[PDB]
Symmetry: C5
């Protein structure tokens, strides 16, 4: 595993090939999670931010940007979307959490909460995922689509098996995240495929 | 009754099913009232914020959001509408009062007064209501319409049988409302139907 | 006469009936005047703010709002219009002066001077007027038009038989007008007709 | 012959007649000049700000406002135009200089330099002008065009037979110009023709 | 050579003739570079900012502005483009770096980083260039196009044979650039052709 403190993945061009695989030792289905990261892109078309598929299951956990100001979460193929005022282009800090017991999904953009939405109450997100940055999966680990590819920079990614309270979301946004047990930027197990370059983070 | 201080109702999806019934021992017709609450929604279509119907009478007291920047009050089916500059999406604090003797309706949005309008001078709002959050009634307690449903979060709801002066409206906006004798968020009698979740208020 | 300090006239609906007549013992033709008042309306269509007609003479002195950002003064049917950057909807303080000797008309909006214009140099505004708020006159006291009616609130109205200097306009904008000898909000002789309600001024 | 400190010319209406003739006793061709003045107009159509014609020569020196945000200088019938971000309507302070040796024209708007442009390198602006405010000349002292007329206010006009450096431009903008040798607001020889009124400057 | 500190090149008109040749003793192909400069133009159409061609190679290194808010870099005829929020017209400070080993191109506009893009990984930029300001080259030193010409002012140009870190980019932006070994504004060898004038820098 690798300490990526102070660094970003750069996906420097549009492709159907360039991606990073993220490896987690996650064998138990998820009832609760929070995912935070920073991104900087000047794409106006739609793109995937974080794609988690399991065997036989597309869009098992997907964070997707449909257009400026609109963020979508998919859980087990079902989707919710919330809106925010944002400048374009601009760096962003994105957190999203989901809680099975209520179905509530919370997006937080630059430390501000979006309107709560709900989906998949009682569901468990399936384990043994393939997790990809830079492309949107339609199969278990593949079937990418360049019109959904992420071109730009991603850093400071964390995933926890709990729903972070507001104080811990703000801490992540400020740069003092709680250590994370599913994915953690200070100890990330990743595989680069194609043209992805690791560079210093210069925009936070 | 339940003290919902620090909490909101979350209406997490569009539906014709999800709603909260609010119960108040209102047996005398209303001459004067003030209603305040906070709301956070990213709907662009029209929606009902507060629906009060009586037997045989639709839109006896209705607070309805036509579109961004436009707030309507219905009293006994008659309507007025006033406009305001607001960001979208954004949390809002809404107060509205009405006084039978003058017919004057006063909206206050985030502590700022809208232009006064007038309707139903001399009328008394009928008693024994069904009061619904989340859906717009067309019958006594029912006949909801998905395209008028509220999706988002509502909290800090208070209703008085008097017209509040500006200083008391500001107190409510600031989080220290005067005690309210029709509906009180700190002693609320309600019934959840369908998918409505109580969560902490994180956006004020 | 009545002291309306701290109060407004509310014209709560569109109509061809609702108006206030202002009474002044003006028997000598006017060579110079200044008129100040505050208004709050969310109409987008054209409307009359102050209508002064004399026997046989329509639009003898008329302050008219054709559209957002544009204020007109008519003197003996002739008009000038000046433009301003303003928010909509928003309360406004409006002063206008005119001087026969030069023909110069000065609008001040929220204490800011508009571009000077000129009309009717050498003319005298005729005496023995009927002065109306809420409607635009087409006869001596009447012939109103619903599509020109004022809906909203007017207060702090003063009229002087001289051209106020800038620092006196500012004093009026700040809520401390100098003594006024044609119309005076603190000793106003008026008649309400139709649906007009006096309420506290809550927006200044 | 007159000190206009604290005063403006008001051109109160559109016409093909109303203007001020400015008379300089300096009689010499111009190789270098700077011209500064303040203006306030709410016209959206094109208009002339300063028109200098010589016998048989149109547009010998012309400062012309094509549309909002665009200022043009003509030297000997040739033109340059530069752009600026400005609010509309708004008072403005305009300086423009031109240097024959380089051909460079410099506009400064409210103390801010526009992009330099170049024209007529080596040319001498002809002597013995008619200089007009309020109208655009097409002949020596005449052939005006109502659609190019200036409506509004002009004050604080100075013209020097040198190119002012930035510090002197700022001094003029701030109300402390260096004494000027072609035209000077504090010792101005002018002739009003038609409807032009001198009033105090109330907008700076 | 010449210290152009405090000065700019002014390209005062649209033309196919006016340009500056920049002379560098660069005989080894470039693997890494950073280029900074300040520009002020009110063109809305596309234009070239910095044109570097070699014998037999068009667009070997080209910095091009297609439209407001979009900056392009060509390396060996391949292009990348990144977007930024910017006012128009407005002075701008532009830096761009490129590193062959990763292919990463970094634009910085007014000291803020744009999204990184990548092109020509492993390529060497050809040596023995002709470098032109004011025009876009289509041959080795020539074949200009009026519709791509730069009209406006350029100064503070530096080019280094390395990729500058953020602190050194900010130093350039703030007016204390590090000495630069390919091109240096403080020791510049240049040739003016046509109508280009050197003037003080008045807009920084
Ligand atoms: C899921 O998260 C919620 C909110 O923090 C918490 O109340 C609950 O205990 C969590 N459930 C599990 C199984 O961890
Ligand atoms: C409603 O308000 C009016 C006007 O102030 C007041 O006179 C009246 O008593 C009020 N009605 C009730 C039932 O309190
Ligand atoms: C109107 O104003 C002018 C100029 O100030 C003055 O000369 C004249 O006397 C005034 N007319 C009156 C007071 O009726
Ligand atoms: C013209 O420009 C400047 C002074 O503004 C100066 O360098 C030059 O000598 C001037 N020439 C004349 C004719 O005064
Ligand atoms: C280009 O930059 C990289 C930065 O690490 C460096 O390793 C390489 O030597 C550079 N090439 C040259 C020719 O300096
Ligand atoms: C097909 C579908 O539902 N979605 C959601 C966004 C990505 C897209 C996809 O899986 O390609
Ligand atoms: C029909 C009508 O007047 N109204 C008012 C707003 C919603 C709508 C309704 O009751 O459905
Ligand atoms: C006819 C006319 O000139 N005007 C001016 C504005 C009101 C309108 C009117 O008198 O009805
Ligand atoms: C004809 C021409 O070139 N111009 C310049 C602006 C005014 C206009 C004119 O002289 O009327
Ligand atoms: C032809 C081409 O590829 N380009 C790139 C920008 C300018 C333009 C050119 O060389 O003219
Ligand atoms: Ca998919
Ligand atoms: Ca897909
Ligand atoms: Ca209804
Ligand atoms: Ca309905
Ligand atoms: Ca009329
Ligand atoms: Ca009329
Ligand atoms: Ca002309
Ligand atoms: Ca002309
Ligand atoms: Ca080329
Ligand atoms: Ca070309």
């Amino acid at each position: 595993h690798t300490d990526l403190s102070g660094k970003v993945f750069v996906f420097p061009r549009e492709s159907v090939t360039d991606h990073v695989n993220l490896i987690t030792p996650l064998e138990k289905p998820l009832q609760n999670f929070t995912l935070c990261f920073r991104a900087y892109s000047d794409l106006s078309r739609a793109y995937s931010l974080f794609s988690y598929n399991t065997q036989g299951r597309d869009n098992e956990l997907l964070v997707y940007k449909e257009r400026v100001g609109e963020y979508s979460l998919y859980i087990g193929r079902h989707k919710v979307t919330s809106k925010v005022i944002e400048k374009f282009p601009a760096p962003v800090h994105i957190c999203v959490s989901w809680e099975s017991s209520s179905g509530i999904a919370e997006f937080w953009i630059n430390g501000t909460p979006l309107v709560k939405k709900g989906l998949r109450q009682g569901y468990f997100v399936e384990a043994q995922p393939k997790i990809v940055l830079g492309q949107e999966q339609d199969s278990y680990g593949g079937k990418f689509d360049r019109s959904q590819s992420f071109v730009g920079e991603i850093g400071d990614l964390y995933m926890w098996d709990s729903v972070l309270p507001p104080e811990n979301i703000l801490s992540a946004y400020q740069g003092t995240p709680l250590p994370a047990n599913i994915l953690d930027w200070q100890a990330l197990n990743y595989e680069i495929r194609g043209y992805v370059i690791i560079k210093p983070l210069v925009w936070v």
